Structure 1
Amino acid sequence: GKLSEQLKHCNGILKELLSKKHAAYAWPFYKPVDASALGLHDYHDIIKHPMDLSTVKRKMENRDYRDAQEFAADVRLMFSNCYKYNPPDHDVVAMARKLQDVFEFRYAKMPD
């Protein structure tokens, strides 16, 4: 069906975001932000819905996502959290921008 086909395209995108090709700028998004470890004691006051690629992978593997839009909402939530919390001149924001470029251009090629 169409939903399964579109979810395969999403899974392809997810595999690419986690691939060695993008590791130089994708790595801050591989696991949940460890606020305590990074000394970010305001992170969970500012970010109400944390998201990261390991959580997206778990949800895909668990068949949590019912459509491509639900998958895209979680990937974009992850980038939005980064843009909300971090100063715009921080390296992690430059890395988010680069990984979101990879995501948006491939997401746009979604099969209809």
Structure 2
Amino acid sequence: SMEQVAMELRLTELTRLLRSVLDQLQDKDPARIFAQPVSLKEVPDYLDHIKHPMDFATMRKRLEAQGYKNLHEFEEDFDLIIDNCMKYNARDTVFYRAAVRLRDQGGVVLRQARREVDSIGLE
């Protein structure tokens, strides 16, 4: 149907916008602390602590499968990256501090993204 094609165009468009957001958020992690999943070879007990791991590479896979239906779903995953880190690592670590900085600097990008999604009407 034409409707299904229209839908897929918007989803494709949403994906295009979120790819830009994802690149902007990742730039706020210059140390690449959040670029890849936490290594279960290096941190063998990680899943005893964190039940829903997330990282930028995994977000990117889902993004390219057009697996984010709306901005809220994308934001949930971003929040998992930060929130997992701020629980696993103590306040006086480079890891916790990197998450705080990513949270604070990312809020700007995400505030804008929410306005653009609403405005251009991508869902």
Shorter-chain TM-score tier: 0.7 to 0.9
List 4+ stretches of structure 1 deviating above 3 A. 3-9
- Partners in 2 of 1:89 and 1:54 — Cα distance? 26
Q: Give the corresponding residue for 1:12.
A: 20
Larger Rg: 2
1:59-102 Cα offsets, whole Å, 9 max, x none, are 00011111100000001011110011100110011111111222
- Partners in 1 of 2:29 and 2:100 — Cα distance? 14
1:5-43 Cα offsets, whole Å, 9 max, x none, are 554432211012334xx4534x01000000322xx3321
Unaligned runs of 5+ in 1: none
Contact 1:82 1:96 in 2 (8 A): yes
Paired residue total? 106
Give the TM-score normalised by the residue count of structure 2. 0.76
- Partners in 1 of 2:83 and 2:97 — Cα distance? 13
**Structure with the larger RCO, 1 or 2 (CA within 8 Å, 6+ apart):** 1
Unaligned runs of 5+ in 2: 1-6, 119-123
Alignment of 1:21-100 (within 5 A): 22-25=28-31, 27-37=32-42, 40-100=43-103
Superposition RMSD in Å: 1.9
Give the TM-score normalised by the residue count of structure 1. 0.82
Q: Percent identical across equivalent pairs?
A: 30
- Partners in 1 of 2:44 and 2:58 — Cα distance? 21
- Partners in 1 of 2:51 and 2:29 — Cα distance? 26
